[PDB]
Design a protein around this ligand. Sequence first.
Ligand SMILES: O[C@@H]1[C@@H](O)[C@@H]2OC[C@@H](O2)[C@H]1O
Ligand SMILES: O[C@@H]1[C@@H](O)[C@@H]2OC[C@@H](O2)[C@H]1O
Lengths: 372, 370, 367, 366
Amino acid sequence: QNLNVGLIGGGFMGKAHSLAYAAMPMFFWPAPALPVRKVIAEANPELAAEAARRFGFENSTSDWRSIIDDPDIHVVDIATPNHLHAEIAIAAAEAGKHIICEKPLARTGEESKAMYDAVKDKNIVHMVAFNYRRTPAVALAKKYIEEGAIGRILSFRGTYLQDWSADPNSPLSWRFQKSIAGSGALGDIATHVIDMARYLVGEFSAVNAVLSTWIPERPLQSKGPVDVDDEVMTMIRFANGAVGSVEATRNAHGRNNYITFEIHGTEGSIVFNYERRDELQVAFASDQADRRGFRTVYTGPAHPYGEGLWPIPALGIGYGETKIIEAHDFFKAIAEGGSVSPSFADGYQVALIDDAIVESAAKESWVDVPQI
Amino acid sequence: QNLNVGLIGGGFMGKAHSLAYAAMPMFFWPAPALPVRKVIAEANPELAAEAARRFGFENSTSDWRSIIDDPDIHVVDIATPNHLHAEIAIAAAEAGKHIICEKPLARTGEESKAMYDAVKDKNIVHMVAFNYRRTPAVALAKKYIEEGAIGRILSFRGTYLQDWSADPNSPLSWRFQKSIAGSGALGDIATHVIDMARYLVGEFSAVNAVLSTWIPERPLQKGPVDVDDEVMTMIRFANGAVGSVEATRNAHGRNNYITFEIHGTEGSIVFNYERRDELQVAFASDQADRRGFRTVYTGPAHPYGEGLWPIPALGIGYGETKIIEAHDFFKAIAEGGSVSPSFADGYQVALIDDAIVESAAKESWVDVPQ
Amino acid sequence: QNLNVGLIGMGKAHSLAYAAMPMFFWPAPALPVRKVIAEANPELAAEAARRFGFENSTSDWRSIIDDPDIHVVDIATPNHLHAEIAIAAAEAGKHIICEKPLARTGEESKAMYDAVKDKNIVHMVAFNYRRTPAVALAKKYIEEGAIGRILSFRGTYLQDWSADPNSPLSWRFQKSIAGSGALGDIATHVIDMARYLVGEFSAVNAVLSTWIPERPLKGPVDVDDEVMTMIRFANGAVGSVEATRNAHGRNNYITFEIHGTEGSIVFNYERRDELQVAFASDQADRRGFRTVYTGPAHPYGEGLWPIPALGIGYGETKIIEAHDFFKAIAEGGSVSPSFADGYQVALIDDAIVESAAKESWVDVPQI
Amino acid sequence: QNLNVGLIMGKAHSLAYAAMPMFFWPAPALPVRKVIAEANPELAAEAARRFGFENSTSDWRSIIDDPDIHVVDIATPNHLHAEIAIAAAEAGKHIICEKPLARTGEESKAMYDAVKDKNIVHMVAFNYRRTPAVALAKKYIEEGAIGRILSFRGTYLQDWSADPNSPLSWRFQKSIAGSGALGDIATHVIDMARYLVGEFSAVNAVLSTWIPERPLKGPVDVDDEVMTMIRFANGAVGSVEATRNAHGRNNYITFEIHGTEGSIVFNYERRDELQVAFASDQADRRGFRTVYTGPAHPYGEGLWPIPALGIGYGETKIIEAHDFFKAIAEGGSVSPSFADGYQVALIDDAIVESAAKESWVDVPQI
Ligand SMILES: O[C@@H]1[C@@H](O)[C@@H]2OC[C@@H](O2)[C@H]1O
Ligand SMILES: O[C@@H]1[C@@H](O)[C@@H]2OC[C@@H](O2)[C@H]1O
């Protein structure tokens, strides 16, 4: 089963998605379906054609509407900035195409809602690309939790710390522009952590939060106001009684892609650091008193997704393997006419949480999360 | 000069203090003053004798009033549970004695006030035992900060995570009893973190917190647990910086996990007490291609180095923190100067705690009673 | 622009490079074509072709040399067949990459060197790990004198995948086919790192070992499980290297620790995104190993991920290979870890074998 | 009872005596800082008040000749190691003795001979091997928990003498010290190997020196860095390496031990941690466990009530002391004994020769 993909957007993500479509069958064999890089769309025809040569798409187009309207495209992948996710995804749904959309699902909850509405009664597979939950080490922690190996979860600390724009001479790209992005650190990076909280712990009841802009204007390369958050911190109460906290910032010198978490359970703990993604740290309370401690577990054949990755632990998981796994699960769901997680349902829930964080920060009070 | 010490209590903080006295001048020489282990109080006379023999005091007693009524006693050291801090220090105050008291200062901010009031206007050195601040790494952090080497502080994340009581069959000690501890994690370990925040970032403007009790009853020596196992709080600092503090007793694999991460405009600092000897600092001024966290091991080139070990990583333990603390306490007495942190700092911490509890109850931002 | 490839054969790793090389490094030196692939029979070879996405397949590997429309040959066979395929491919004027170790022995390897040394072809051995961005950064550091002149060296490669005696007796455990054990399999990658970072070897003295005598199919192992050699370098530096298969808790632990006159470097491939660099010129109160995450600012970083610690995996390593290999071809220059390097290493292996025989130091036929 | 000590780096030992009973209690024997010696009567008096001795002296002889004292403790450079040890032994004095035991094994012989026939409680200060983490390794091993030992790596990397303008102290002078790194530091690793595996049967090494002249500028005549391989008497193979010219390493005493059914790793820059990987872990959760030392672990009965409250150099020597004073008050032996001390010295000479010619060299195994 060969599926033609139409990739919309050929920036950093275009390359990550193309990589996965190229590589995924080499990894997961026999593959549930073969990706075909059939057509890539970009802002103008020279870029489109150049992106296609670079990523190995057969065709190219200056209009994505060309892809939605082409009946032999089975999969629309949306790798555009956050302002185009909804319009393209709703056209794709109406055209009955299977859809993977990059995060955040959209700019607001209300806009994420329409995308969900347009998809939820169709007979298509819809996905949002929170690829980090498919880091093997994160699946491994999920396995540990679900098999009861750390007891009931008490507590969750999560972070996403970067510094790529800590320098205020960094320009005012779309990530800093509210009307395109919807939010700053919150939508761009905190959403990956929120998804991990949801996957590993469970649903959010309420949030109580603080948003900070540290660099309120930047040069307009290619002096503009930064009307989004640079940093977010929020306390969380979970439906299942767990408590927790998330912190994300663009302004943490010495932190590059420091997605982490620490889960405290009644019978153990789990710690994850994406800058060292090959590793999961786990402490079992049932260890013998003189050999109790976090053990560092390197992922490989023995761990979730091991079958289709590298032959020994620590041969090296990179960004690209997270996207290969994602694609595997997506195309598997299509091949077997099932659903995948996280879906637009998961996407819309994250957008509601985000809105509840913004709300909470304006009112400076606990705000209950709407549960879809 | 030979200052005589009246130690009240010889428990888990029995050998800690007594080591400090015994060893301080060995380390920092010439010494400001020689601590003399004069007398130690415990609850019963046999217990006290046992203690004095062990901790190498000259004398002992069962009544702590004895100590405060002796005019030979230059220094009182309070290492009792939290229910007796106040009454002893207020008495010791009147007796004109120098005081060092364990944390938390008292069970509440009302009880802490008294103690503060009782030393305010008296001409005596008063110290509260937030010893972890005097880990060299944390002094080295203070150094970089106030040097301006990491710029203006944006953010503070601090933790004190433990697991000694994570097992529910762990018995109901005083630390789990509200009326004698005052509070749980908040008092017993959060207070260490709060102080480091006050020390490295500055004063608390306001807090918004959650307290949690996971194991609500424990076997007796079963009885209820009417205190804090875990505390989560966000913070507004008086200086614009934001941050958060998190402490627990129910974190499997966390033993003495006092950490912080500070984010400045020009750099970052990371500390982990489970590896005391190290401080992580990351400078923006580094060349693009050799920029990241540098792991500095502490020794002669760092604060308090001159009177610790001759090379970095020969190793800093719990005892050294107490040695450095003693030195600074006695150097203050010797100079008729003063010391940080004092009962003013302890009182402040007790207000932050009260505001935290008040916050958790109201599920609201509370302004810290400055 | 379009070089046709003929892979013959962990053949996914190579196929990923060819698929993915132009996505990363763009403009591409030359667009690779997965044209043909050979395996031990035509069904497996047709399986391989569907999985790894080659246009065409064969069970007879001579076919691919015999084809003139090929350009590149990629030898991912076990260790007994490198030279046969290498020599044959050389005579056909074929651009070549071959896996490590170059062959079972130095002599076997000598052939391969001569076959190519004369010809008009880019030739390469598959020391991919040296193209880990962190290791390439550690070069940038050493070559600008930033660590001064190199004194000492401690490379390792500790694995544990056959530390169970019940792990079966595959080909990597037969001198017949593997040549050596840990020495040729993995120690070979560290020896190349030594050469690329400090310099040429001068003499070595070694204790080969075997902890697993028999493994199931129950037959004998007739190769080294573990090797430590001591080293004197041409430049005057000192060093030691220790590669094993029997270190429980070690998976793909490729360590090095260089000591220079103005600094140090440590590397751990298990955390390959990091290099640790300690500079003596650091203010004395803020001096120590600093942890550098590789990214755009560092070597090969312009055509990898847009931010550090987004993650480098085994694959990007091989991607950078395919980039430099094809870069050599499309220009006409030459790629470093060549058969020369393969041959030199094979000799170091021979020396090391000798050393553990003669319980003494053994100079190294520098070439 | 009160075992009066005579203390001929000096603040570490004094700390031990002062502190050791409040740690381990009921204590085995309450030490007395009774006499301290040193270069001259000024330094001695100064040192005596600092480290809280009852008396001082400028002649070490006087301490031997004083039959009120119970214990000698040598803390001088290597040149003065021998002529004190014998005298103290003849005098029938209990002994501790800063490593290395002597500038040469030649000399060390006498020191063992002098002791062993009389039933002295006698020791050499290999303090690191009583870091609780290393004790926990011994316990793991002894228990079989990592099965049989196969291989061994050990290190001592330092950088204090890594700037050439660093002064020509007594550790770069052959006649005084005897060995540089080999005997100043590499000796500690040797002791660990000997303790966690077994005896050395043969050795090969390379000595190296990177800074020949220093300010005092005189000439440096000793080994800056030493690299050696090992064959253990039980089959195991090994490596030992130490240097003074390793920028970024401060006090980096380390080992990695591969067992049949596990591995153990130690980094003294983080003494509180032992890293153990048990092969018997389930396959989806297998790897190095970082264990923080506390009550559950060895020596934990008399240290801090919580793991990671923190172990420093001092605690190391408080254990060294309580073992010794435990060995006097019950009368048995103590490892590492002068025996252990001499073996190390022999091992050290083998290494000297090993490097000398460039071939392997058996270890005269006592
Ligand atoms: O999702 C992406 C992350 O992997 C990383 O963080 C910033 C940018 O790159 C973000 O859009
Ligand atoms: O034995 C001592 C070591 O613990 C340490 O390293 C140098 C010096 O201090 C040495 O004499």
